[PDB]
Amino acid sequence: VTCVSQMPVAEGKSVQQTVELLTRKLEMLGAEKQGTFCVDCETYHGKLMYVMHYPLSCFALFENGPCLIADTNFDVLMVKLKGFFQSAKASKIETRGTRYQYCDFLVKVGTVTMGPSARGISVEVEYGDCWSLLLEFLQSFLGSHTPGAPAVFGNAVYGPADTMVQYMELFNKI
Amino acid sequence: NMMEYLLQGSVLDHSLESLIHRLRGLCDNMEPETFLDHEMVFLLKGQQASPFVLRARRSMDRAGAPWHLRYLGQPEMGDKNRHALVRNCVDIATSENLTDFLMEMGFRMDHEFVAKGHLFRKGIMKIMVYKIFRILVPGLSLSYLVELSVVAPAGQDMVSDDMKNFAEQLKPLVHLEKID
Amino acid sequence: EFHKQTMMPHPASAPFGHKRMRLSGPQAFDKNEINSLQSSEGLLEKIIKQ
């Protein structure tokens, strides 16, 4: 299902140039423009906000994925706690970018938010672990990358928004 | 944002048949039904002596449907020449994950009394009825309390006149009332 | 068309919505399913049938 994302291991040049080279390699492999999305990020001292595919959000410091609410359904509750859990610190960096799909797959790269930020990538699959099959895709796409590190021996499971831990880890690495 | 309304009341036990029969054939297509809920009224406070609206009472019916709570507290002033009005909200959460996060966030309970009853599909509004039952986990005013529960944004708020007209129509054994 | 836009919702207690619409929470369905939540009718159906 929702495969775990991967940190931008490849970092040897300009982030813009890196994204350009990644898109060029994707086009050389052969794909189509599957639209563009965004990956929000706002922490509260913990709960990292975000929204993606569609009208639903997540924010959780450390919990078993309590998400079944949309953007407004959670924003209203957040604003209601103006003194209980209102910990809106400095705005966390958030990436975005387009999305492509070779076949039964999807790819999505990130960009910097303030400029000294990362350019991580995200990929998923259509099966339910299939961690071996998805690897060869990136192996043929780029060099040594995609460690994966899924939650093995658990069936969290299916990785619902579990990538947020690695996201916050990369965000703290600044 | 949204708003909240209420037409709280009560009625005797023997006098329910004619009441529910009258209330049924008003705007319902067909096949009236009912539902038994589950009481998980909680409380989220401990820092300002002002509790929140944590009445996480969700039905124990067929699974799949996600549990949720609505905001009902701190009746705000206003409503010039109108009925009861208070800012409300709604937020759905994953099955059993909501109570998990509530217990992880360090909150306490508020009540354990369940109030099952019937539902009735109104028109631009909505009505509900239930009777308090003092029972255990798996199984008491002794009177079916009814009200006109309806949620909507600011808009025009002309629905107050419609609610008053319905209350006028619902004259015999029920009326409207606010709460404070 | 009357039925699909009317059997009562009864999603959780009384949010007064649609079953499929209410089911958006439990699973973040793809844009395809989001579009398939609704559909067209009338001329298109008869044309496809003919």
PDB file of C-alpha atoms in Angstrom, chain B residues 30-150:
ATOM      1  CA  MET B  30     -40.439   5.613   4.371  1.00  0.00           C
ATOM      2  CA  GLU B  31     -39.067   2.895   6.667  1.00  0.00           C
ATOM      3  CA  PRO B  32     -38.612   4.614  10.049  1.00  0.00           C
ATOM      4  CA  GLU B  33     -35.808   3.124  12.126  1.00  0.00           C
ATOM      5  CA  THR B  34     -34.063   3.505  15.483  1.00  0.00           C
ATOM      6  CA  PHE B  35     -30.621   3.227  17.081  1.00  0.00           C
ATOM      7  CA  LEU B  36     -28.941   2.417  20.384  1.00  0.00           C
ATOM      8  CA  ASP B  37     -25.985   4.631  21.278  1.00  0.00           C
ATOM      9  CA  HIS B  38     -23.035   4.202  23.647  1.00  0.00           C
ATOM     10  CA  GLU B  39     -22.073   6.655  26.385  1.00  0.00           C
ATOM     11  CA  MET B  40     -18.410   7.702  26.462  1.00  0.00           C
ATOM     12  CA  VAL B  41     -18.850  11.219  27.837  1.00  0.00           C
ATOM     13  CA  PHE B  42     -15.361  12.445  28.715  1.00  0.00           C
ATOM     14  CA  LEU B  43     -13.801  15.654  30.013  1.00  0.00           C
ATOM     15  CA  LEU B  44     -10.681  17.522  28.838  1.00  0.00           C
ATOM     16  CA  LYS B  45      -9.544  19.982  31.514  1.00  0.00           C
ATOM     17  CA  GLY B  46      -7.204  20.471  34.464  1.00  0.00           C
ATOM     18  CA  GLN B  47      -5.523  23.813  33.776  1.00  0.00           C
ATOM     19  CA  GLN B  48      -8.164  26.585  33.873  1.00  0.00           C
ATOM     20  CA  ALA B  49     -11.130  25.101  35.833  1.00  0.00           C
ATOM     21  CA  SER B  50     -13.174  25.363  32.598  1.00  0.00           C
ATOM     22  CA  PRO B  51     -13.936  21.955  31.048  1.00  0.00           C
ATOM     23  CA  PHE B  52     -14.390  21.384  27.314  1.00  0.00           C
ATOM     24  CA  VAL B  53     -17.168  19.692  25.361  1.00  0.00           C
ATOM     25  CA  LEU B  54     -15.816  16.127  25.456  1.00  0.00           C
ATOM     26  CA  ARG B  55     -19.150  14.275  25.293  1.00  0.00           C
ATOM     27  CA  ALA B  56     -17.733  11.593  22.979  1.00  0.00           C
ATOM     28  CA  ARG B  57     -20.999   9.654  22.925  1.00  0.00           C
ATOM     29  CA  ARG B  58     -20.995   7.553  19.758  1.00  0.00           C
ATOM     30  CA  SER B  59     -23.416   4.840  18.694  1.00  0.00           C
ATOM     31  CA  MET B  60     -22.528   1.185  19.244  1.00  0.00           C
ATOM     32  CA  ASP B  61     -24.281   0.158  16.007  1.00  0.00           C
ATOM     33  CA  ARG B  62     -22.811  -1.667  12.985  1.00  0.00           C
ATOM     34  CA  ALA B  63     -19.066  -1.077  12.652  1.00  0.00           C
ATOM     35  CA  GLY B  64     -17.293   0.702   9.807  1.00  0.00           C
ATOM     36  CA  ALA B  65     -18.891   4.048  10.639  1.00  0.00           C
ATOM     37  CA  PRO B  66     -16.367   6.341  12.367  1.00  0.00           C
ATOM     38  CA  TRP B  67     -16.930   7.689  15.862  1.00  0.00           C
ATOM     39  CA  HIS B  68     -16.971  11.452  16.443  1.00  0.00           C
ATOM     40  CA  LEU B  69     -17.962  14.241  18.838  1.00  0.00           C
ATOM     41  CA  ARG B  70     -19.602  17.633  18.373  1.00  0.00           C
ATOM     42  CA  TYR B  71     -18.885  20.903  20.154  1.00  0.00           C
ATOM     43  CA  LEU B  72     -21.621  21.821  22.634  1.00  0.00           C
ATOM     44  CA  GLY B  73     -20.706  24.224  25.424  1.00  0.00           C
ATOM     45  CA  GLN B  74     -20.290  27.834  26.519  1.00  0.00           C
ATOM     46  CA  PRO B  75     -23.613  29.256  25.259  1.00  0.00           C
ATOM     47  CA  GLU B  76     -22.693  32.556  23.614  1.00  0.00           C
ATOM     48  CA  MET B  77     -24.829  35.671  23.878  1.00  0.00           C
ATOM     49  CA  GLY B  78     -26.751  37.255  21.008  1.00  0.00           C
ATOM     50  CA  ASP B  79     -29.548  35.706  18.932  1.00  0.00           C
ATOM     51  CA  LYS B  80     -31.686  38.853  18.889  1.00  0.00           C
ATOM     52  CA  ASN B  81     -35.345  37.779  18.627  1.00  0.00           C
ATOM     53  CA  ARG B  82     -34.185  34.203  18.046  1.00  0.00           C
ATOM     54  CA  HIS B  83     -33.967  30.882  19.868  1.00  0.00           C
ATOM     55  CA  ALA B  84     -30.973  29.269  21.588  1.00  0.00           C
ATOM     56  CA  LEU B  85     -27.767  29.620  19.580  1.00  0.00           C
ATOM     57  CA  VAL B  86     -24.174  28.582  20.286  1.00  0.00           C
ATOM     58  CA  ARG B  87     -21.049  28.083  18.170  1.00  0.00           C
ATOM     59  CA  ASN B  88     -20.624  24.373  17.439  1.00  0.00           C
ATOM     60  CA  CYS B  89     -18.295  22.149  15.414  1.00  0.00           C
ATOM     61  CA  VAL B  90     -17.814  18.553  14.276  1.00  0.00           C
ATOM     62  CA  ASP B  91     -14.809  16.306  13.687  1.00  0.00           C
ATOM     63  CA  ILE B  92     -14.806  12.651  12.637  1.00  0.00           C
ATOM     64  CA  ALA B  93     -11.996  10.351  13.738  1.00  0.00           C
ATOM     65  CA  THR B  94     -10.807   6.805  13.073  1.00  0.00           C
ATOM     66  CA  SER B  95     -12.586   3.849  14.656  1.00  0.00           C
ATOM     67  CA  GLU B  96     -11.443   3.447  18.287  1.00  0.00           C
ATOM     68  CA  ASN B  97      -8.422   5.664  17.583  1.00  0.00           C
ATOM     69  CA  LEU B  98     -10.252   8.676  19.026  1.00  0.00           C
ATOM     70  CA  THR B  99     -10.632   7.099  22.471  1.00  0.00           C
ATOM     71  CA  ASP B 100      -7.042   5.852  22.188  1.00  0.00           C
ATOM     72  CA  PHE B 101      -5.731   9.392  21.735  1.00  0.00           C
ATOM     73  CA  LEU B 102      -8.110  10.681  24.429  1.00  0.00           C
ATOM     74  CA  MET B 103      -6.687   8.209  26.952  1.00  0.00           C
ATOM     75  CA  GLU B 104      -3.143   8.971  25.760  1.00  0.00           C
ATOM     76  CA  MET B 105      -3.715  12.722  26.215  1.00  0.00           C
ATOM     77  CA  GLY B 106      -4.676  12.244  29.874  1.00  0.00           C
ATOM     78  CA  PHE B 107      -8.408  12.960  30.041  1.00  0.00           C
ATOM     79  CA  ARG B 108     -11.160  11.711  32.349  1.00  0.00           C
ATOM     80  CA  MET B 109     -14.746  10.587  31.863  1.00  0.00           C
ATOM     81  CA  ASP B 110     -17.911  12.564  32.583  1.00  0.00           C
ATOM     82  CA  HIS B 111     -20.866  10.146  32.498  1.00  0.00           C
ATOM     83  CA  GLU B 112     -21.726   6.516  31.777  1.00  0.00           C
ATOM     84  CA  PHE B 113     -25.494   6.736  31.210  1.00  0.00           C
ATOM     85  CA  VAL B 114     -26.724   5.682  27.770  1.00  0.00           C
ATOM     86  CA  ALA B 115     -29.827   7.200  26.147  1.00  0.00           C
ATOM     87  CA  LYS B 116     -31.171   5.166  23.239  1.00  0.00           C
ATOM     88  CA  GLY B 117     -34.185   6.226  21.213  1.00  0.00           C
ATOM     89  CA  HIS B 118     -35.540   6.884  17.739  1.00  0.00           C
ATOM     90  CA  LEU B 119     -34.619   9.260  14.927  1.00  0.00           C
ATOM     91  CA  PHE B 120     -36.820  11.118  12.459  1.00  0.00           C
ATOM     92  CA  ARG B 121     -35.846  12.717   9.147  1.00  0.00           C
ATOM     93  CA  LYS B 122     -37.196  16.273   9.081  1.00  0.00           C
ATOM     94  CA  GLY B 123     -36.882  18.727   6.200  1.00  0.00           C
ATOM     95  CA  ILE B 124     -34.502  21.693   6.317  1.00  0.00           C
ATOM     96  CA  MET B 125     -34.197  20.854  10.027  1.00  0.00           C
ATOM     97  CA  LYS B 126     -33.697  17.679  12.050  1.00  0.00           C
ATOM     98  CA  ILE B 127     -35.231  16.205  15.207  1.00  0.00           C
ATOM     99  CA  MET B 128     -34.156  13.441  17.592  1.00  0.00           C
ATOM    100  CA  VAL B 129     -35.507  11.713  20.699  1.00  0.00           C
ATOM    101  CA  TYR B 130     -34.004   9.477  23.381  1.00  0.00           C
ATOM    102  CA  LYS B 131     -34.592   8.230  26.925  1.00  0.00           C
ATOM    103  CA  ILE B 132     -31.878   8.039  29.581  1.00  0.00           C
ATOM    104  CA  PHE B 133     -31.018   4.522  30.743  1.00  0.00           C
ATOM    105  CA  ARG B 134     -28.889   3.788  33.799  1.00  0.00           C
ATOM    106  CA  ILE B 135     -27.200   0.511  32.842  1.00  0.00           C
ATOM    107  CA  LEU B 136     -23.785  -1.149  32.918  1.00  0.00           C
ATOM    108  CA  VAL B 137     -21.224  -1.275  30.085  1.00  0.00           C
ATOM    109  CA  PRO B 138     -22.897  -4.109  28.105  1.00  0.00           C
ATOM    110  CA  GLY B 139     -26.341  -3.830  29.734  1.00  0.00           C
ATOM    111  CA  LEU B 140     -32.885   7.593  34.310  1.00  0.00           C
ATOM    112  CA  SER B 141     -35.523  10.319  34.003  1.00  0.00           C
ATOM    113  CA  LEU B 142     -38.002   7.703  32.725  1.00  0.00           C
ATOM    114  CA  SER B 143     -39.210  10.142  30.074  1.00  0.00           C
ATOM    115  CA  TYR B 144     -38.475  10.462  26.354  1.00  0.00           C
ATOM    116  CA  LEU B 145     -36.618  13.753  25.976  1.00  0.00           C
ATOM    117  CA  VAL B 146     -36.936  15.326  22.524  1.00  0.00           C
ATOM    118  CA  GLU B 147     -35.333  18.312  20.809  1.00  0.00           C
ATOM    119  CA  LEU B 148     -34.682  19.924  17.407  1.00  0.00           C
ATOM    120  CA  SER B 149     -30.992  19.315  16.733  1.00  0.00           C
ATOM    121  CA  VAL B 150     -29.745  21.103  13.615  1.00  0.00           C
TER     122      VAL B 150
END
